[PDB]
């Protein structure tokens, strides 16, 4: 008696994601008792087991009809060991394969039941039009990343026969344009680096495809450190930047703008100081100009004080679609007194419903043991124990970045916290980021999922 396991997957019957390329896995035999003598078993394909599997598990899988190349099919079990040598399975992709989930049973002659998801041209098999239950906002740094990677990241929701695939993000923020003085040194203008220019100049290639798959796409605007920005514009300057932002979203088919309140290098003394009232007047003007296009606000330690109070009757929270902070890998709760994780009252925005606040903005950085405990504690205790459920509606990822050495642990989890709370805990639906594991997945440090091509 023994078990035919996968070498890289703990799932008894692993589900591989085949996006128009081959997929592979290795399996081995684990014997309940150590081998008395050196024996060799052989693994083979038996597609006759499919009908019994679909009856037992309620599924509808058709046996995988593509070419399957098994190498090292003879499993060597040395005396005294319980695990054999590893066989290798290469599932060949071909255009003659329709998009579906297939089954390929591998037997000893127990049994392992490989499931192969053959993707369509836009989404995996069993993709659904069912919308994500929460708003997931993803930054893409156009200096290193292709915005189209959003169209490759999915959530595998549920367990068979109730599997569903949904896009992992619903809003995408493009990093970044900046605000600086104009050539005459009197007016603010938007400045675009070489990367964000090519993205916007080719919005038909990089933006409309995202919008076609349900993504709202916004342009982020930071400062360029010349001391002029969203919170210190006079009447004339405000009308200029409002006009230019309104024009920019119309010109490139953008759904909205993300006001990233950082890097303006505001002076601490002089005649153009930052004020929360100026910010409220500028954003109020922006809202009149762009109508229902999205305005979001990213708060930082460089934000002006007073946003917890109305400014000339204006509450910034009433006129913005979403807000969040740069307090990465930590759940910020500005409405919680005696907060055991730290007082976040500085991040309070007057008029902002909790359901519009990204309490958790995660970033791709390795965390210490303490930092890791702070992240999970702040998330769980605030949303479940303290009862701030409304803080589970918006989740933000500041830069979907490449998974590399030293950030594999955060890479695997920092895009799943919103699905973890909303689906796995608040409902019973298991969530998995796809395409994660395996050669070529988002978590393969030697592969780029959807690389920069300009």
Numbering used by the authors: 42 to 150, 163 to 507
Which of the paper's sentences describe this entry?
The genomes of Bacteroidales contain genes encoding glycan-degrading apparatuses that typically co-localize in discrete clusters known as polysaccharide utilization loci (PULs). B. thetaiotaomicron contains almost 300 different GHs belonging to 60 different GH families, and secretes at least six mannosyl-glycoprotein endo-β-N-acetylglucosaminidases (ENGases, endoglycosidase hereafter) that hydrolyze the chitobiose core of asparagine-linked, or N-linked, glycans (EC 3.2.1.96). Here, we discover an ENGase from the GH18 family in B. thetaiotaomicron, BT1285, encoded in a distinct PUL with its own repertoire of proteins for catabolism of the same HM N-glycan substrate as that of BT3987. Altogether, our data suggest that human gut microbes employ evolutionary strategies to express distinct ENGases in order to optimally metabolize the same N-glycan substrate in the gastroinstestinal tract.
We found that PUL16 also encodes another putative GH18 endoglycosidase variant, BT1284. However, this protein contains non-conservative substitutions of both acidic residues in the catalytic site, thereby lacking the canonical catalytic DGxxxDxE motif of bona fide ENGases. We found ENGase-like proteins homologous to BT1284 throughout several Bacteroidales species (85 sequences in at least 20 different species) with similar substitutions of catalytic and substrate binding site residues. By enzymatic activity measurements using complex type glycans (from both animal and plant sources) and HM N-glycans as substrates, we confirmed that BT1284 and one ortholog from Bacteroides faecium (Uniprot ID: A0A6H0KVH8), which we named as B. faecium GH18-like, were indeed catalytically-impaired. To better understand their lack of catalytic activity and glycan binding ability, we determined the X-ray crystal structure of B. faecium GH18-like to a maximum resolution of 2.67 Å. The crystal structure of B. faecium GH18-like revealed the presence of a TIM barrel fold typical of ENGases from GH18 family fused to a β-sandwich domain in the N-terminal region (DUF1735), similar to BT3987, as well as a β-hairpin motif common to GH18 enzymes with specificity towards HM N-glycans. Structural surface analysis in the putative glycan binding pocket of this ENGase-like protein, revealed that HM N-glycans do not fit as well as in a bona fide HM endoglycosidases. Together, these data indicate that ENGase(GH18)-like proteins were unable to hydrolyze or bind N-glycans in the assayed conditions, but may they still play a role in the metabolism of N-glycans in HM-PULs from Bacteroidales by some as yet determined mechanism.
